[PDB]
Every structure is written in structure tokens, then in C-alpha cells.
Amino acid sequence: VGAXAXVXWXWXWXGX
Amino acid sequence: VGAXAXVXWXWXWXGX
């Protein structure tokens, strides 16, 4: 979670 | 991966 890939900013889910 | 939790900077594995 947070930033890069997962739940957060960039890849996966949430922000970008 | 990247930053926050996982493989990367903060929690889990790698940097902090």
C-alpha cells in the first residue's frame, strides 16, 4: 500500500 | 512495490 503498485498511487488500485 | 508497505521504502522489505 501507499505509492508504486498495490492500494495507493500508481499501479493496482486508487490513485495515478 | 515502491513506497509505503511491500517491496520498497517503509514497511515490509527493502528501504526505510
Cβ distance of B4 and A1 shorter than 8 Å: yes
Please give the C-alpha separations between residue B10 and each of A2, A12, B4, B7, in angstroms, as whole numbers: 10, 18, 5, 9
Least Cα separation, residue B6 to chain A (angstroms): 7
Spatial CB neighbours of B7, under 8 Å, sequence gap ≥ 6: B1, B13, B14
- Minimum Cα–Cα distance from A12: chain B residue: B1
The answer to whether the CB of A3 falls within 8 A of the CB of B10 is no
CB atoms within 10 A of CB A13: 10
Nearest-neighbour CA in chain A from B3: distance (Å): 5
Measured CB to CB, residues of chain A less than 8 Å from chain B are 1-6, 8, 10
The length of chain B in residues reads 16
CA B14 to CA A11: how far, in whole Å? 19
Method of determination is NMR
How far, rounded to the nearest angstrom, does the alpha carbon of residue B7 sit from its chain's CA centroid? 4
For B14, residues 6+ apart whose C-beta sits below 8 A from its C-beta are B7, B8
**CA dihedral of A13, A16, B6, B9, whole degrees rounded to 10:** -160
As a whole number of Å, the end-to-end CA separation of chain A is 13
How far apart are alpha carbons A15 and B14 in whole angstroms? Answer: 23
